Subunit: 233 residues, 4 copies
């Protein structure tokens, strides 16, 4: 009944949207969860909503020193990590001719750099046999107007799942990417989507649970699309 | 606790290997299971192993009339299908120059023709919101010596999950393909596999469970690789 | 200037459309061409059009004996084959529920069976270092309404490039798939195509030329989409 | 006879390797080539090797002002660009745990940042109906030990081809990625490569030529693997 019973999870971008829904589903599956996000208020809100088996950590994942502090706290409170959901994502729309150094640095900092160090700094705490879920996107295999740097960064995220799969294999740590389509997070995607609707954060959390749990024990390096068929037809 | 509580599942190739493994896991999850295979004896053994909530049906899914009789039995005992796992596979190893018309016919009849019809005739029993999983293979994306027809036919399988995704969306039926790598069924594959081992049939069953269950509610038209990272790296 | 000077090419579906367009280009690049097709009239028109270095052979390539006759003619006139463009293809729209045994058989015969035996029976004639191009389709990676068997069969054709690449590597023979989008042969595809138009048969011929010629000597096993962007964005 | 007769090509990384191979082949095909790179010595040597119809321009394509300056020179000397080969590439091997912020910044600046601004700044000179080729890599779809950032950056590159295809379709500018496998540039990869050898730089230049020429006029948004079958089987 409790597919994650007594496992320790760390979830970044855990103050809202898909991170928050995964946190809630994880606690329901018997996990202890760390939610990590930038906004104090949102973390307090999110933790109260989760209500049990949860520590909230204020951290900007793009800042290395913030990650060291995160992982000291994790070390102190629970001692190790069974599941890491390295969830990050910020989309700013700009076409090629509109891109600035600035737009670029911010897109890649948040979507790639901070993901890379999130996972790097977590290695000393990851148990052998553990599971890492990277958030990529449908955008990482599409050519969408004005999504130049976002799509490119999320294709970078999916690649990291293959490299890490090779690198961490000696510790039996699985690394997989989840690639959400349109998720209803606080229409064109809905139009071309076979299931005919945006997905719910609940549905994305369920897909990450699979990747998190022993049910995906032979599943490694994959890109799991959770996009109601958007990219598959 | 029970992730297919009271759903009715149909599994073809249900008398052994991943079909049997899936049926045991499905019953564990509170589903009622129809196992379907060619051998009365194997089916009797299989049913005893599963032990409850199972009907065994002798059908050669490459024969249209056998599928008629299958679905009539399913219809009289349970009235509709929630999960159809259309699981077939016959592999015979011939290189291009060794291919006979009989080898071609048998390989495609069991892997493609029989699957098509299996799914066509399940249509009138399948519930709206139901889930259909097809058994593809990592061979469907690899260039493997002497696997000419089997690999070709398994790609045909993965393609059908796309077309069916588009054709059944009007009914909310999700169609997805599972692509197993090496599975231990009663070393070279294992050597190139990042998890470093063959998978257990129960690990394949678990991945089919995900597709079968509400956790995959926003997943449609995918190829789910269950191959320890073989095709991913 | 003459990219295929003194090369012997065999082209199936040679009497119209992409097959004829490829023959014409292959002739203008200095090749000696066999066009193979079922209709005498079309072949005579085609040979007249091509105008030089061409033998037209009336063969149904789904028939093993028509292939034996074809290749005895190839062997006696030109000896061995530098380039085989095993271009097959026919489509009939039927949804899953409309699928008949006749429909499936006819689709798989034309699109897969004949293609396997075409390439099988060319083996003793293929020069070492020669090039085999298969016609697949964008359909082999899409979920198109009512394209069930045509798409499934084209995916199979793409898979044969991979396996054949492994099997004939000893003889340095490259096998690659070409996947056309919409080609103009005497809107909806054109609507979703970035280039905003259907392809000319001449453009597909140019892509096949590339696989045919030395320019692609390091390219093997691939699926070259020629669809003005259809499957890529 | 001359496939780029009087076309203006801009090639970055043009002082060595596949850049230089491509410049040479392009001049053979009657183009006027600008070779762009960091080292004056290397540029001078490469310009003498090519021999005719070439300007060498010293530039760090990671610097916006060096690019403004490149395009001023191109604008003055030739007025417009028909073919842009945005070829960039630096690899340094580091495993995840070895990654420094500096290792990360260098890989992405060169392989991605530089690439974006290269094409962005080419836009006012690019003729309508022009052709843009981006160098990706087989690394972009593999999990190779210690290739974390390079493979990731190369997957970003492939994505950009998709996004640009959509952004630029209004001008009929085609954008495609070439993904080299192992290339002999001044055994492990040969081992898993169906062709059984490394690719020659001339062979990569031929493939880029295809993308640059009118033969690929209906080809957009693709990843063209030129890797002897490495990623295809």
């Amino acid at each position: 009944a409790y597919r994650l019973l007594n496992k320790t999870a760390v979830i970044t971008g855990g103050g809202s949207g898909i991170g928050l829904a995964t946190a809630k589903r994880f606690v329901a599956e018997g996990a202890y969860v760390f939610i990590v996000d930038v906004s104090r208020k949102e973390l307090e809100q999110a933790a109260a909503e989760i209500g049990r088996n949860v520590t909230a950590v204020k951290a900007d994942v793009t800042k290395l020193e913030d990650l060291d502090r995160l992982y000291a706290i994790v070390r102190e409170q629970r001692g190790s990590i069974d599941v890491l959901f390295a969830n990050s994502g910020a989309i700013e729309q700009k076409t090629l001719e509109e891109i600035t150094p600035e737009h670029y640095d911010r897109t890649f900092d948040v979507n790639v750099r901070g993901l890379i160090f999130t996972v790097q700094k977590a290695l000393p705490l990851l148990r052998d046999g553990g599971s890492v879920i990277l958030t990529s996107s449908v955008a990482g295999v599409l050519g969408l107007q004005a999504h130049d740097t976002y799509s490119a960064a999320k294709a970078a995220v999916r690649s990291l799942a293959r490299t890490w799969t090779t690198e961490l294999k000696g510790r039996s740590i699985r690394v997989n990417a989840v690639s959400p389509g349109a998720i209803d997070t606080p229409a064109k995607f809905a139009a071309a989507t076979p299931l005919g609707r945006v997905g719910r954060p609940e549905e994305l959390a369920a897909a990450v649970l699979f990747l998190a749990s022993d049910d995906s024990s032979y599943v490694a390096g994959i890109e799991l699309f959770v996009d109601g068929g958007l990219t598959q037809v």
